[PDB]
Amino acid sequence: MELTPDQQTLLHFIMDSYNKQRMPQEITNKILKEAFSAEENFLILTEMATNHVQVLVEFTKKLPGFQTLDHEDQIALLKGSAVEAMFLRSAEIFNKKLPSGHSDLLEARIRNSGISDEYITPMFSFYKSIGELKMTQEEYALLTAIVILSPDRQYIKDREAVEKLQEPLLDVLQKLCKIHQPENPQHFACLLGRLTELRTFNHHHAEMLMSWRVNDHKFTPLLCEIWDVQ
């Protein structure tokens, strides 16, 4: 029912690693500052994503038992989760309460940043759906760790070794859902269900990036490696 000393220790350690990310305000203040062109926005978002991947690798390395895993599986786990983790983080940032009309202005700037409407509509639908769950920072952090440590990922040699690392994190999250939301016994199921929804953003990701209304699609070498672009 309640968190054991080891579970409390695990949660606090995951939270410290997760808090090393760029602050939601640091991302929202840049966008909400001035009205930027599609060429400027693509450059702003490319830098944001490069930083996201950089901090994600550091967070991933800190996950208990990740260093003990086979080198090939480590790469496949990061490459297979990077996009999902970026959309989970983007959802956390968008749903952060801001002053009156600020979240609506942020939505407007992203919708008019150069991206095709075909990819925007399911993206803001997912952000608004995630928001409805009223997730805490601990749930966002644990859900990110669960996403990264998904054994049912492509090209993984030893699934069982990944299962053993994900299992305590699922147990911690399950306990937290029963604590923060005892009114809704389906809350944990909703979170896990949102992981399947996250997987849909993978297949057409490179397509969304190349269909951006910019003459030239420049990416950093790290993004090219993680997103399989250029």
Binding site: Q54, V57, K61, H71, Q74, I75, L78, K79, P221, L222, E225, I226
Partner: peptide, 11 residues
Amino acid sequence: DHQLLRYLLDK
């Protein structure tokens, strides 16, 4: 090869 990702993982 994912040499940049492998480097960031080793260090």
